[PDB]
Write a protein that binds this ligand. Structure first.
Ligand SMILES: Nc1ncnc2c1ncn2[C@@H]1O[C@H](COP(=O)(O)OP(=O)(O)OP(O)(O)=S)[C@@H](O)[C@H]1O
Ligand SMILES: [Mg+2]
Length: 251
């Protein structure tokens, strides 16, 4: 785990709710833009859960071939389809006793949403082509940068799955709504980068104000990118307004 650095009320609330849902087995939904810490939040939840010493299993919902998605999620037994010479355990079976992290749940296709639902209310599943219904034991943590209720109304997300998953919602404020945290965030990212052989910089107040007026569409991950790049261009340097890429200058 990392900790969620920062002193905004938003991030403090996020910490409080994390402390409250962690050692429960409730489905957690983390909503937030790209780069805002949603996976951090998930890994932290997990390592402070009953599952904390079982497996943490990510599932990147839009980055699996549909043609194989079922078998990736639920495993297959030999000769289920063409190419099925071995017998795979699925992400779910892999996760039994741990946490399953559905990364971008809004990109999960509908047939997979119903199957996921069957798992959350029944706690069973079968490998593809297989008869044997295995029980399964995981804690669900899903994340999204999408508007799930809108999708519900566009009929691209299932309402029943929605209310089943969204037991404990946690919202992650975008960086541009937490500028108070940027310096802290900086000190963290730089510290990591030092503890990782990888270089050193620091920022002066003008630079820091400039970065505090930036829109951060990639949020914290964009910030981390900037720290790495600047540490290359100005090794062990102090970063002022004129060292920032023009993109990040706001004076
Ligand atoms: N509050 C925070 N304190 C410290 N480090 C953070 C914080 N939030 C994010 N990070 C770090 O900055 C990066 C943000 O990435 P993620 O947490 O994976 O964001 P995300 O919401 O999961 O983005 P996606 O959904 O994968 S595009 C990671 O390298 C984290 O370690
Ligand atoms: Mg992620």
């Amino acid at each position: 785990f990392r900790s969620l650095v920062g002193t905004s009320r938003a991030i403090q609330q996020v910490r409080q709710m994390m402390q409250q849902v962690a050692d429960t087995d409730a489905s957690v939904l983390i909503l937030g833009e790209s780069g805002t810490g949603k996976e951090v939040v998930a890994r932290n939840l997990h390592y402070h859960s009953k599952r904390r010493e079982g497996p943490f299993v990510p599932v990147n919902c839009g980055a699996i071939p549909a043609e194989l998605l079922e078998s990736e999620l639920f495993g297959h037994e030999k000769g289920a389809f063409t190419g099925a010479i071995t017998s795979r355990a699925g992400r779910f079976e892999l996760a039994n006793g741990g946490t399953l992290f559905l990364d971008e749940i809004g990109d999960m296709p509908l047939p997979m949403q119903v199957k996921l639902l069957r798992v959350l209310q029944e706690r069973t599943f079968e490998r593809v082509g297989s008869n044997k219904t295995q029980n399964v034991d995981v804690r669900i943590i899903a994340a999204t940068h999408k508007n799930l209720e809108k999708m519900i109304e566009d009929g691209t997300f299932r309402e029943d799955l929605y209310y089943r998953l969204n037991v404990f919602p946690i919202e992650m404020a975008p960086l541009r709504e937490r500028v108070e945290d940027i310096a802290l965030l900086l000190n963290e990212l730089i510290s990591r980068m030092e503890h990782e052989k990888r270089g050193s910089i620091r920022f002066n107040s003008a630079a820091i104000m400039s970065l505090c007026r930036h829109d951060w569409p990639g949020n914290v991950r964009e910030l981390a990118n900037l720290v790495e790049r600047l540490a290359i261009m100005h090794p062990y340097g102090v970063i002022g307004v004129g060292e920032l890429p023009k993109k990040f200058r706001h004076v």
